[PDB]
Structures are given as C-alpha cells and as structure tokens.
Amino acid sequence: SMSVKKPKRDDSKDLALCSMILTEMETHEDAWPFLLPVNLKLVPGYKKVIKKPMDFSTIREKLSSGQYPNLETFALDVRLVFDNCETFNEDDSDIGRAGHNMRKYFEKKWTDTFK
Secondary structure, three states, X not given: OOOOOOOOOOOOOHHHHHHHHHHHHHOOOOXXXXXXXXXXXXXXXXXXXXXXXXXXXXXXXXXXXXXXXXXXXXXXXXXXXXXXXXXXXXXXXXXXXXXXXXXXXXXXXXXXXHO
C-alpha cells in the first residue's frame, strides 16, 4: 500500500530474456504456423471467429518497440497465439499438434527462466 512495498525484484534483464525465449520459439521446427499473421483475406472464417489475432512476428515487433509494459503482458500474447490455434484447429491436425507442442516448449522456458 502507500509507502509499504515488497522488496524490489530485479526486472532489468526481462527484455533481453523474453527476446531470447522468442528467438527459441521462432527457430523451433514446429513454429511455421505461427511465424506470420494469418492471412485474413485467404482464410475463411478467421477474421470473424478470432477476435484478437496474434503471431510471433507481431510479438517480435511489439517487443522491439517497447509495447510490452512488463513480462506478463508478453506471456499473455504468446499464450494468445496458442489459444487462437486451439480455437480454430482440430487437435488431430498438423497445426493443432504444432500448437500444443509450442505451448509446452514455451511454458517450460518460461518457468525455467522466471520461476
């Protein structure tokens, strides 16, 4: 509360560390469905159904331009990528399985880096 604070966690490396995580996600062989925005002119149903599209290139641009106020807003966009994928793709599809694999890969890096 006012003049009453928990001890200051060092957040000065967060930006760099989120960038490294994102590089590792970018270079995973199952990243291909997530590298670029879904083409809303060429994929029927996507625009109407997926209210907040997100992809790795969009996260990278947001990261690079100081549009993440903290590491939690960064994790929310990464997870949004996988949540969108589960909304639109059957679990038993190449893309559906890609999304599950990438979400697992991400959550481990996240826990190991920050928890």
